Amino acid sequence: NFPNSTNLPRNPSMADYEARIFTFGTWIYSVNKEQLARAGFYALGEGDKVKCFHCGGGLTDWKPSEDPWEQHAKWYPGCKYLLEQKGQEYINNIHLTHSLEECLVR
Ligand SMILES: C[C@@H]1CN(CC(=O)N2CCc3cnc(Cl)cc32)CC[NH2+]1
Ligand SMILES: [Zn+2]
């Protein structure tokens, strides 16, 4: 499914932080639910799988070192919610650092 790159959220029912919070329930996982919700994510009830309310972008297998905002940027760089909240300069930073993380191991 293609990532939503318009200024209009794919899932408007999940546009409020509070609405997103409710989707998690008791959350055992490596990453903080509040932090996820702040980064636009709501839980699907399929392990730790989350989707952004805006771009629709899905992410799973959250490691303790993985930051919701950085991951959002890494995998869904066209997301307009991300651009609004963080700005393009943060977005470019994250891409630069992840691209440079690759050439440092490769
Ligand atoms: C949090 C981090 C996410 N990472 C990538 C990931 O989960 N991706 C890459 C694109 C994609 C599409 N659809 C789903 Cl469901 C997941 C996903 C894996 C390690 N943990
Ligand atoms: Zn998004």
Would the CB of 58 count as within 6 Å of ligand 1? yes
Pocket test for ligand 1, best of 44, 75, 76, 101 (most atoms within 8 A of CB): 75
**CA–CA gap between residue 35 and residue 104 (Å, rounded):** 28
Query: CA 69, 76, 94, 20: dihedral to nearest 10 degrees?
Result: 0
Would the CB of 98 count as within 6 Å of ligand 1? no
Ligand nearest to the CA of 14: 2
Experimentally determined by: X-ray
Fold observed for domain 1-106: Inhibitor Of Apoptosis Protein (2mihbC-IAP-1); Chain A (1.10.1170)
Contact 51, 40 (CB under 8 A): no
By CB atoms closer than 10 A (0-12, 13-18, 19+), residue 72 is: buried
Q: Which residue bears the tokens 């950085």?
A: 70
Distance 50 CA to ligand 1 centre (A): 9
Resolution limit in angstroms? 2.2
Radius of gyration of the chain measured on its C-alpha atoms:
14
Would the CB of 6 count as within 6 Å of ligand 1? no
For the chain, the structural domain boundaries read 1-106
Amino acid at 4: N
